[PDB]
Design an enzyme around this catalytic site. Structure first.
Site, mmCIF file in Angstrom:
data_model
loop_
_atom_site.group_PDB
_atom_site.id
_atom_site.type_symbol
_atom_site.label_atom_id
_atom_site.label_comp_id
_atom_site.label_asym_id
_atom_site.label_seq_id
_atom_site.Cartn_x
_atom_site.Cartn_y
_atom_site.Cartn_z
ATOM 1 N N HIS A 209 3.070 2.271 2.215
ATOM 2 C CA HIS A 209 3.476 2.863 3.676
ATOM 3 C C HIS A 209 4.578 2.119 4.197
ATOM 4 O O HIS A 209 4.905 1.020 3.877
ATOM 5 C CB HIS A 209 2.055 2.488 4.502
ATOM 6 C CG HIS A 209 0.857 3.188 4.138
ATOM 7 N ND1 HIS A 209 0.320 4.445 4.554
ATOM 8 C CD2 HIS A 209 -0.015 2.586 3.077
ATOM 9 C CE1 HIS A 209 -0.850 4.536 4.060
ATOM 10 N NE2 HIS A 209 -1.210 3.545 3.175
ATOM 11 N N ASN B 50 0.978 -1.238 0.077
ATOM 12 C CA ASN B 50 0.008 -0.132 0.042
ATOM 13 C C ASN B 50 0.742 1.278 0.005
ATOM 14 O O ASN B 50 0.315 2.338 0.012
ATOM 15 C CB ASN B 50 -0.980 0.061 1.124
ATOM 16 C CG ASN B 50 -1.625 -1.385 1.291
ATOM 17 O OD1 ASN B 50 -1.510 -1.930 2.551
ATOM 18 N ND2 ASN B 50 -2.501 -1.571 0.461
ATOM 19 N N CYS C 239 5.584 7.402 9.325
ATOM 20 C CA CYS C 239 6.536 7.782 8.549
ATOM 21 C C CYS C 239 6.383 7.785 7.222
ATOM 22 O O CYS C 239 5.875 6.755 6.796
ATOM 23 C CB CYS C 239 8.036 7.609 9.178
ATOM 24 S SG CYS C 239 9.214 8.131 8.086
#
Ligand SMILES: Nc1nc2c(Cl)cccc2s1
Ligand SMILES: Nc1nc2c(Cl)cccc2s1
EC number: 3.1.2.14
Lengths: 263, 265
Positions: free
Chosen positions: B188, B186, B223
């Site tokens: 991330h 995804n 992050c």
């Protein structure tokens, strides 16, 4: 994992893992590079052996000089991929290791790779002049007749790579390897250099294209405390020229080319 | 990989790979963290997920980790088979807990154990909320009803509060950026990368003279692919204990905090 019937090649099946795939749910080129590396260590282990038994009396190791990978289909998450590997002497230059990647359900070739290895002194680095004769203990574990993954005359795996001229079109600066980027001997594993080369490729190209071919030349090793700059210029399918160099002095450590197709 | 006979837990065997081990020829804590993650995805797949339901997808809700606590006794050697058993359990309206048990495939003895706290969150706005009634009823069927804890102890270190690292820090690894291999499907940053970043501030001498026993990590903020991170460490303590803090370089926003425990080899 097991050696084939003749003992001149090794085979191993791999189920693709969740964290191993990219944004298109297929294994990344770094995951594939790690599987090629894993099947090579298990082939070395099965025949009684980057370090390798014998030649350690001279403090001699095998180092990669070139890695060429060509993928047709990237295996999906959950799929089984079978990899067959083998080695072959190239006279006094060194060793070549080839790989064939197949789908475990169809049995069709989905990728192929080739690498050029050379004998180096593990202490003085550089190379202790690759030219040995009484090193005939490897001829018993190699097929005698030529068996090339990339056999064709005038192919991408043997083409000369030029040096990227300044200024570069794209750049990823300040790259440092962490403890996960090091192997058991604390050297940066060769797969991290592939990841660093691809960092300068813009996000749009990664999102609109798939990596078809990647040829990479190894010139110098990056230490755990060195900082690296990744440079890229479109030379053209989209083709690119790459250059990894130390962020300070500009010492060249790597150079290569990548070829990408539209999805 | 397969669900056990009752269907209330999942099991999977893993052969340790060459690139997965550290300087001691045993799997790194990041390799173990990836195997816990892999067995959790295969447990979600075996019970019909992708771990959202038709109810969670209708409301753009996702599960996010809030705490990860891992305790290792023996790190599996390169070539060894490690069996991991995983299960989930409701904790009322707070959220879910996922536990793991790591065993040696030759001896059958527990070589490690882990626990995690997961919370409900809107993937677009990042706002947390207490688990709804009609959502909770869809998971109770895949969880053991009686309590089954990997860390049962009366005062286990998996539920202890973690303080904020005060400045100045004793050790620091500055300017850490995640590359494309640190991202999941995804896009991330993978939860395991934060563990690697936390350990970057630990001096080399401690890694060479000690082995990591316990690691508790609290997740506060995620992050992004374009963020730069600073890793901070201070010895708080035979066993050496540390306090950790991951924060963004641009403005110092806290993203992670934790503790690690190390013993002499
Ligand atoms: N240099 C060579 N290394 C090898 C290995 Cl590791 C396995 C099989 C054949 C050869 S020839
Ligand atoms: N929240 C929960 N998710 C799960 C999954 Cl993914 C598998 C088994 C039980 C549960 S309870």
């Amino acid at each position: 994992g097991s050696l084939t019937e003749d003992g001149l090649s090794y085979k191993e099946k791999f189920v693709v893992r969740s964290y191993e795939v990219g944004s298109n749910k297929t294994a990344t080129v770094e995951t594939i590079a790690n599987l090629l590396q894993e099947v090579g260590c298990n082939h070395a282990q099965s025949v009684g052996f980057a370090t390798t038994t014998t030649m350690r009396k001279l403090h001699l190791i095998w180092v990669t000089a070139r890695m060429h990978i060509e993928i047709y289909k990237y295996p999906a998450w959950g799929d089984v991929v079978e990899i067959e590997t083998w080695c072959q002497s190239e006279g006094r230059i060194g060793t070549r290791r080839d790989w064939i990647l197949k789908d475990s359900v169809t049995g069709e070739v989905t990728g192929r790779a080739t690498s050029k290895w050379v004998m180096m002194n593990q202490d003085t680095r550089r190379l202790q002049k690759v030219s040995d004769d009484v090193r005939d203990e490897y001829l018993v574990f190699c097929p005698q007749e030529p068996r090339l993954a990339f056999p064709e005359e005038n192919n991408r795996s043997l083409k000369k790579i030029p040096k990227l001229e300044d200024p570069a079109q794209y750049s990823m600066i300040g790259l440092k390897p962490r403890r996960a980027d090091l192997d058991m001997n604390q050297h940066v594993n060769n797969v991290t250099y592939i990841g660093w080369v691809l960092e300068s490729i813009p996000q749009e190209i990664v999102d609109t294209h798939e990596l078809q071919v990647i040829t990479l030349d190894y010139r110098r090793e990056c230490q755990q405390d060195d900082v690296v700059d990744s440079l890229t210029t479109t030379t053209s399918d989209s083709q690119f020229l790459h250059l990894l160099r130390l962020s300070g002095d500009g010492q060249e450590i790597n150079r290569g080319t990548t070829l990408w197709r539209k999805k």
